Write a protein that binds this DNA or RNA. Sequence first.
RNA 1: AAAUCCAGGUACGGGUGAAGACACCCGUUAGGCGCAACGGGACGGAAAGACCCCGUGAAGCUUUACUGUAGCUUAAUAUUG
RNA 2: UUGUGGUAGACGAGCGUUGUAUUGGAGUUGAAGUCAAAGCGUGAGCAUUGGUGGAUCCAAUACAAGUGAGAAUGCCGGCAUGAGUAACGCUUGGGAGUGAGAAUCUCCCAAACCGAUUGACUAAGGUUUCCUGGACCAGGGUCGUCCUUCCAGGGUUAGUCUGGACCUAAGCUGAGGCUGAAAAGCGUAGGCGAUGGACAACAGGUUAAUAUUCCUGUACUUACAGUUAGACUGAUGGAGUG
RNA 3: GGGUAGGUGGUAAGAACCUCAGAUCCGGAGAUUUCCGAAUGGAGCAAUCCGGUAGUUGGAAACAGCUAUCAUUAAUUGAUGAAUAAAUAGUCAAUUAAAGCAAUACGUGGUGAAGUGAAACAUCUCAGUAGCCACAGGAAAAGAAAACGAAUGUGAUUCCGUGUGUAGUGGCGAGCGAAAGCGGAACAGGCCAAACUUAUCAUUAGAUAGGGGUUGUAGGGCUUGCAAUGUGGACUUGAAAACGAUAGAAGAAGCUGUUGGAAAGCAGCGCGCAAAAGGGUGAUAGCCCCGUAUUUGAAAUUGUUUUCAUACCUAGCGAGAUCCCUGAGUAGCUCGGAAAACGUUAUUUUGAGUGAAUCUGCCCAGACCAUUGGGUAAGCCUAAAUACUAAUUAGUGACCGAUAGCGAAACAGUACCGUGAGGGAAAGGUGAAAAGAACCCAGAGAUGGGAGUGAAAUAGAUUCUGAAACCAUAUGCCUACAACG
Lengths: 64, 111
Amino acid sequence: AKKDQLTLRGPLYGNNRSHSKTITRRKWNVNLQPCKVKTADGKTTRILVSTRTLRTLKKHNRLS
Amino acid sequence: MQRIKKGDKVVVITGKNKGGSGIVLKIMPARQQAIVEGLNKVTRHKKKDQTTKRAAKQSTGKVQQEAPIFLSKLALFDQKAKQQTIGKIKYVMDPKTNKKTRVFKKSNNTL
RNA sequence: AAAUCCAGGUACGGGUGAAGACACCCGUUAGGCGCAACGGGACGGAAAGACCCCGUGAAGCUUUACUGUAGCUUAAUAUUG
RNA sequence: UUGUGGUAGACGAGCGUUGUAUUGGAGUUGAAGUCAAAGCGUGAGCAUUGGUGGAUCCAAUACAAGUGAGAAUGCCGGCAUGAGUAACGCUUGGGAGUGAGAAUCUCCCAAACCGAUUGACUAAGGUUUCCUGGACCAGGGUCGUCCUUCCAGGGUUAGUCUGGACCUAAGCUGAGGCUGAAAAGCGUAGGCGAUGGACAACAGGUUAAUAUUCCUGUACUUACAGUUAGACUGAUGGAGUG
RNA sequence: GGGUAGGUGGUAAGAACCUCAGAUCCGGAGAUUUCCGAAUGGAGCAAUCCGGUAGUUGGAAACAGCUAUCAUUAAUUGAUGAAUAAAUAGUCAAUUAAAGCAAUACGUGGUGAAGUGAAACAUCUCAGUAGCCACAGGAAAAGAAAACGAAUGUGAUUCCGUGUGUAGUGGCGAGCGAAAGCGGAACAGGCCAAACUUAUCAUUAGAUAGGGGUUGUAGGGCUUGCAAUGUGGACUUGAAAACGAUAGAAGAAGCUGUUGGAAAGCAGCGCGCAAAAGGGUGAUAGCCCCGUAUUUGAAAUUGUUUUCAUACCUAGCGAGAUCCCUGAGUAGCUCGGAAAACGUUAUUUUGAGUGAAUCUGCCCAGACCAUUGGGUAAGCCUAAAUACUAAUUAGUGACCGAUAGCGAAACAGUACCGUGAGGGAAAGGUGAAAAGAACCCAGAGAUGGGAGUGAAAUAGAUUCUGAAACCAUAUGCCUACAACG
Ligand SMILES: [Mg+2]
Ligand SMILES: [Mg+2]
Ligand SMILES: [Mg+2]
Ligand SMILES: [Mg+2]
Ligand SMILES: [Mg+2]
Ligand SMILES: [Mg+2]
Ligand SMILES: [Mg+2]
Ligand SMILES: [Mg+2]
Ligand SMILES: [Mg+2]
Ligand SMILES: [Mg+2]
Ligand SMILES: [Mg+2]
Ligand SMILES: [Mg+2]
Ligand SMILES: [Mg+2]
Ligand SMILES: [Mg+2]
Ligand SMILES: [Mg+2]
Ligand SMILES: [Mg+2]
Ligand SMILES: [Mg+2]
Ligand SMILES: [Mg+2]
Ligand SMILES: [Mg+2]
Ligand SMILES: [Mg+2]
Ligand SMILES: [Mg+2]
Ligand SMILES: [Mg+2]
Ligand SMILES: [Mg+2]
Ligand SMILES: [Mg+2]
Ligand SMILES: [Mg+2]
Ligand SMILES: [Mg+2]
Ligand SMILES: [Mg+2]
Ligand SMILES: [Mg+2]
Ligand SMILES: [Mg+2]
Ligand SMILES: [Mg+2]
Ligand SMILES: [Mg+2]
Ligand SMILES: [Mg+2]
Ligand SMILES: [Mg+2]
Ligand SMILES: [Mg+2]
Ligand SMILES: [Mg+2]
Ligand SMILES: [Mg+2]
Ligand SMILES: [Mg+2]
Ligand SMILES: [Mg+2]
Ligand SMILES: [Mg+2]
Ligand SMILES: [Mg+2]
Ligand SMILES: [Mg+2]
Ligand SMILES: [Mg+2]
Ligand SMILES: [Mg+2]
Ligand SMILES: [Mg+2]
Ligand SMILES: [Mg+2]
Ligand SMILES: [Mg+2]
Ligand SMILES: [Mg+2]
Ligand SMILES: [Mg+2]
Ligand SMILES: [Mg+2]
Ligand SMILES: [Mg+2]
Ligand SMILES: [Mg+2]
């Protein structure tokens, strides 16, 4: 599914309000992007994470 | 235990037959009835049926048998007492044999 | 068996009447009851008119009617040196 | 004294049903129900007697309601009218017999239609409708002693037939895996999937009902073991054929 | 274990047996438990087909009996091991869990309409309802203030009444509608991270296993002393006792006469009661029977509570130092949404982007700033009051009494309808007792008329009572020149 693999954070369902306040259901999807995380110099899996989790990994010196 | 057993003398205290003394030949606990010999004589109109070795003859005319009687209408008959009377019974347990025995309440007669 | 059937013992002419009468008014005619026929009438039977109108009814379709939207396209921003 | 027609409508006073609470009373010497009659009331309504019936019911004062049926092309059940009317959905005569009863059942002789079919073998489906004896509640558009109806008993025999233990087509399922808010969708290896491919039995007879299945006669095929003789054996893979 | 003298389940008579060495029956605990079904050796059109492996018994083997085992996923461990040296991916084996169902009911979360109302309709309402899906539990959820809120104030959460249809929010229209405070039900607060320290990992640890700590009238760590050996838990094992649950035992008191088929009704004379609740017995029984009030009893399983011991957790007030720690892609901010009564806004939440500080710190008191005051976010667990009843036991009803009550009083989700999902009926009463009509007559027989049983046969299996419409028979009256709501 369109969800993170490190965390479980997924899509966010809400309303699409326009002029005249017409209601139409819409879905916000997470910015899923591919990244490779080294683990003890091995198993460089090409995991699919969000950009928020990618920033967390970057500031943690690629720790997960 | 039971008020009426198979064998003891019994009489009827209500109905057309009053003071009818007899011996209980068989007791049905489920239907609360009791077959007593000589009382409640009914005469089924015996037909003729021939489909078996015994049914080839099955000689049955005006056979009078026994009709069952409600156990409530029955009352135990006293024998040990010189002047016999109809009464109710207890369920005392004598420690001599530790077995329950019926004893009348208007006298001291066992069973 | 069947649809039908408010209860019926259910004539014709002129008139009248919710405006075209077996039943009302005035006249005429007609013994009681069947059977075989043919359809004049009973505004005959079957279908809460499909035509018309009404309802701030429904549905299908159309468009430069309104409000939106899938899709398509453009830019900013993140992945992105 | 003035009044008393009346729809929509407003107001007031009452009847009746079921049950509950308090009092009293009746009832196998006959309660409710139910039918009939020549009664009483201003109205809803209320009694008396007799028949039937077989165990509950009544009066008063209050209280609570699933409390009042003529209509809704109202629902359910029964019964009329139409009406003994339309209809009874392609096939004749006679002789003998059974039987309480025969145009309709059994047998026989004809007769009339089918005869690229109303004839015979089977697939699919039907699921005992098949055979024997008995019956005539119901069903049979009439009748019935008779039936594909009902009752009781019985009937379907495979190494070779039709399908599995063999194989695949369309397609289905599908560990991992991919995709997707969830349920799930797609899909690889494998596995299913005939309407196709490969595979050894023919002739006759027999019972009321089964027969390449049972019986007779003559055969064939595939496995395993022992044995004799010969030969080096050669697949989960390659190739040819299929 | 209880309990007896009968039993072999109902339509059900008969045949044949069992049973007083204690049967049938009731209660507790066990044994066996075919096939399908989560179905799980493989398949498949459910209750079928086809197997593998390791044993063991017959055979000369094929083979055939009799046993046990063989699905998938996840976690742990061990072995083996590619591209490619090492190492992973992968493969195999062992152990432990998960699958599914239902209680037409409650809980949480995700997703989420429309009929309708606004007398049209699009904002809005309906409604975060129906439905779909995931996860449970015996309840769930929530929960210990970065809080309410305006005060010499209260001090987790949950539920009930009021505050009130109030403040407010709404094409300011239809409508929607709290949070404080007050009165009640119940009441409980605990524990990690970081400092600091110990031991070990080629100690590059930035990792593992321990001691120390859990905060707001700030807490803890660093150094230095006094007082402590207790009280209490949401807590483990045992032992003992009490109160129960699942069979039971005992359990008082009436005769006579009358109508009647039958007395229990009626009448006379009595009696018992911690029992006058109820059911049956030929009518309407306190004293006929079973029971009820009351007193009692458990071998075995199981529930609650209490006592004792036993683990685990659990402990105060000072001094100095001025040093360290207090939860970061976090709180804020911007762009689109939402939650709260609010139609987006101080507070809460998040899809995209950006991004802080460290007790002289940070957040809050409806934009915002300053003063004052309140509180300590970015970590976790939490009994009670609360929601519901498919089921077990007892009981109740100014609830129903075969068109009513559950669709279903009977063998009802049946017969039947449909390819399927699905839809879905009608039907109860003989008599006290079958004593269910032997026998005669007519008839082929069913059946009818007598006889017989019975109080009643016009109670006869067509079986309580039997209404009307409807169809026939008959006493009496009228009707064939007669226009008829
Ligand atoms: Mg809307
Ligand atoms: Mg008719
Ligand atoms: Mg005129
Ligand atoms: Mg019309
Ligand atoms: Mg319109
Ligand atoms: Mg509309
Ligand atoms: Mg673009
Ligand atoms: Mg008047
Ligand atoms: Mg009354
Ligand atoms: Mg009467
Ligand atoms: Mg009514
Ligand atoms: Mg009719
Ligand atoms: Mg007729
Ligand atoms: Mg006619
Ligand atoms: Mg005719
Ligand atoms: Mg004709
Ligand atoms: Mg014909
Ligand atoms: Mg003919
Ligand atoms: Mg011809
Ligand atoms: Mg043919
Ligand atoms: Mg049949
Ligand atoms: Mg035949
Ligand atoms: Mg025959
Ligand atoms: Mg006939
Ligand atoms: Mg053969
Ligand atoms: Mg196959
Ligand atoms: Mg084939
Ligand atoms: Mg044949
Ligand atoms: Mg025993
Ligand atoms: Mg709407
Ligand atoms: Mg509207
Ligand atoms: Mg409207
Ligand atoms: Mg909880
Ligand atoms: Mg007893
Ligand atoms: Mg007693
Ligand atoms: Mg009584
Ligand atoms: Mg803020
Ligand atoms: Mg809202
Ligand atoms: Mg402060
Ligand atoms: Mg302020
Ligand atoms: Mg903090
Ligand atoms: Mg019913
Ligand atoms: Mg009925
Ligand atoms: Mg069917
Ligand atoms: Mg008779
Ligand atoms: Mg009748
Ligand atoms: Mg009757
Ligand atoms: Mg005359
Ligand atoms: Mg004349
Ligand atoms: Mg005239
Ligand atoms: Mg006249």
